[PDB]
Structure formats: structure tokens, C-alpha cells
Amino acid sequence: EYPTVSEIPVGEVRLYQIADGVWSHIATQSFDGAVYPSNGLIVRDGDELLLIDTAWGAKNTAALLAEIEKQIGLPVTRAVSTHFHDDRVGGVDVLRAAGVATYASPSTRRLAEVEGNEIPTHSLEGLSSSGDAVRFGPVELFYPGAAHSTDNLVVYVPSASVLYGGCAIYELSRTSAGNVADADLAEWPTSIERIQQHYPEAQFVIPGHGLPGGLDLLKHTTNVVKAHTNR
Ligand SMILES: O=C(N[C@H](c1ccccc1O)P(=O)(O)O)c1cc2ccccc2s1
Ligand SMILES: [Zn+2]
Ligand SMILES: [Zn+2]
Ligand SMILES: [Zn+2]
């Protein structure tokens, strides 16, 4: 049922309802000659929506807003980017122009600026040390420690037991690390264990790219990371 890379024409955005008031958004980026899927999250909060992550690029993010208006019809009032790379912040300027208040940790904003990427407007306090958590509308934001990037956040929806791992969590079909240029390989397994410790009740786990599963995705990611460490 979950849309896969091949089932989404490039440039389009699909929404997948995970639970009451919780969707993922799925988009594609054809880069270096190959096609990659990417996930973000949408969480209802009363009569408004919280967006987690852009759809990787201005045109994709414009299509995301159009699909949200078409299928859900509630306004996106805030957005959080979970780390500084273009698959999370590319499209922030589109969100800002549409009147969405954009947020990231101060570490993410700084890294995005250094990279020349788009920079969310607001700074999320209370997330600077591993293990820190804060509530943000209908979600909890959690900084597990450095992993895929030093600034990566994860997002938990307590009403639905949905854990969105972003790019710190790999889908099961990804058995090699790929590009990890900004990762902390040494800390990544420890950061994953903090996620497990904090969200042992999670029933759905959404990776940054590809198919959702359960908490098994965490130990799978640790296995991939450790194998890459010993490469
Ligand atoms: O989007 C992916 N990389 C992200 C990325 C790459 C380059 C520049 C910016 C950027 O944000 P990332 O490293 O997540 O930030 C990938 C997704 C998939 C999916 C399946 C198999 C391999 C890959 S590689
Ligand atoms: Zn990244
Ligand atoms: Zn504002
Ligand atoms: Zn990613």
C-alpha cells in the first residue's frame, strides 16, 4: 500500500495516511542519474497541520503544499526540518513564501548556512544535548545525539505511536550506508539506542527514505552502520 519509488512519477508528491491525523509525504529526486524516494511527516493539530521536512526541493515542496490543500484542506502553519541537508530544508523558501513558519534547531540553522542551503526562520530551543526532548504542538522532538548528521532530530507522535526517524533511520531494503559524509559513525549506534530507550512503545517507524516498518528498523540501521564502520 505504501507508495514506492517506481510508483510515483518524478515531481509528484503522494500522501499516505498512517493513523488518524498522521500522514507521511513521499516525493522523488532524480539526481546523478538515479531516482530516490524521500519521506516527511504531516501531523494534524486541531484545525491546522504541522509539517515535518520539505519534499527535497522547491518544485517538489510546491507540489507538496498543493497536494496537502487538495487532499487534507487544512493549513500548514508550522514546519520543522530535522537536519540541515537539502532533502530536509530544500523548499524552506517555498514554505516561507506561502506563509508557513519554519523551524529548526540552532545547530541545524548554522550547518544549513555553512552549506549554502535554505535556512529555517525560527530556532528550536531545548535540543542541544543528546537525550533532550521538547513538545512542539502535537509531536515530541527528540535529539538522540549525532548519527546521520550531528544535528539530526527525530519526531514522535504520541497519539498515534508513530516514530519518524528521518535520515538517522534506514529502511530495511537499504543494506549499505551509501553517502555518510557528515555522519558521526562512532556515535550513531549509541544515538539509535537512545531512540529505542525513549520510544519503546512506537508501533510505526518511518525512515527518511523508503518503506516504514517497526522498531526493527533501528537495529537494522545499527547493523548497516557498524558494517560500514568496519568496511
Ligand atoms: O536522499 C538521499 N540522500 C540525501 C542527500 C543526498 C545528496 C545531497 C543532499 C541530500 O540531502 P541525505 O544523505 O539523506 O541527506 C538518499 C536516499 C536514498 C534512498 C535509497 C537509496 C539510497 C539513497 S541516498
Ligand atoms: Zn542528510
Ligand atoms: Zn515566525
Ligand atoms: Zn535523507
Author numbering: 32 to 262
Sentences from the paper on this structure:
Among the resistance mechanisms, that mediated by metallo-β-lactamases is of particular concern as these bacterial enzymes dismantle most β-lactam antibiotics, which are our widest applied and cheapest to produce antibiotic agents. Mimicking the transition state of β-lactam hydrolysis, they target the Zn ions of the metallo-β-lactamase active site. For further analysis of the binding modes, we co-crystallized 5c, 5d, 5g, and 5j with VIM-2, and determined the structures of the complexes by X-ray diffraction with 1.34–1.92 Å resolution. NMR and X-ray diffraction unambiguously demonstrate that VIM-2 binds the stereodynamic inhibitors with a conserved primary interaction of their phosphonic acid to the Zn ions of the active site.
The crystal structures of 5c and 5d unambiguously show that both, the (R)- and (S)-enantiomers bind to VIM-2. Interestingly, the opposite enantiomer of the same inhibitor is bound rotated by ~180°. Whereas the binding affinities of the inseparable enantiomers of 5a–m cannot be measured independently, the observation that VIM-2 complexes of both enantiomers of 5c-d were obtained when the protein was crystallized from a 1:1 mixture of the enantiomers suggests comparable affinity. Alternatively, a cation-π interaction of the benzothiophene moiety of the inhibitors 5c and 5d with Arg205 (Arg228, BBL34) of VIM-2 is found. The guanidinium moieties of Arg205 (Arg228, BBL34) and the benzothiophene moieties of 5c and 5d are parallel to each other with a shortest distance of about 3.5–3.7 Å in the crystal structures. Common to all inhibitors, we observe the strongest interaction between the phosphonic acid moiety and the Zn ions, with a consistent O-Zn interatomic distance of ~1.9 Å. The inhibitor binding affinities of 380 VIM-2 mutants were estimated using molecular docking, of which 37 reduced the binding affinity of the (R)-5c enantiomer, 105 of the (S)-5c enantiomer, and only 21 combinations affected the binding of both enantiomers. Hence, 94.5% of the mutations do not significantly weaken the binding of 5c.
